[PDB]
Each structure stands twice: as C-alpha cells, then as structure tokens.
Amino acid sequence: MSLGVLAAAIAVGLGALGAGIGNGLIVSRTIEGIARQPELRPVLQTTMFIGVALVEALPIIGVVFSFIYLGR
User: At which residues is N-formylmethionine found?
Assistant: First the structure.
C-alpha cells in the first residue's frame, strides 16, 4: 500500500510482458520441436497457433502493467 509498490507492479507487468513472450517462445520452441516428428506433422499447426497465442501475451500483459498504474 504505497507508491513504491505501485512502481513494482508496473515493473512487474513490464517484466512479465517481455519475459512472458520469452516463456511462450521457449515453450513454443519445444512444442514445435515435437512437431518435427512425422506423426506430429499436424502438431506444427498446433505449435503455430500456440506461438501466436503467446504473442497475445505481449499486449495482454502490457495492458495489465498499464492497469496497475491506474491503480488496478
């Protein structure tokens, strides 16, 4: 309950924003790797959608951080 913590809420949203994309890219990396298989040929499509969905975390989280400032 202060201003300092507030900034922490922002620095957090910004951290999970850029970090999030990385967490989604990391998972997407391994996800797409499994698709590399023959029986997992269709998995590629699943990895492609999972990647984009992960990109939706950039703006999503970005909104969170912004919301924090507003005071949540």
Answer: 1
Task: Provide the token pair at 60.
Answer: 């999503």
Residue 29 has, within 13 A of its CA and on its CB side, a CA count of 6
Fold of 1-72: F1FO ATP Synthase (1.20.20)
Closest CA to 47 of 32, 37, 34: 32
Please state, in angstroms and rounded to a whole number, the distance separating the CA atoms of residues 21 and 57. Answer: 6
Enter the tokens of residue 22.
């990385």
Method used to obtain the model: NMR
The H or E element that residue 15 is part of is: helix 4-35
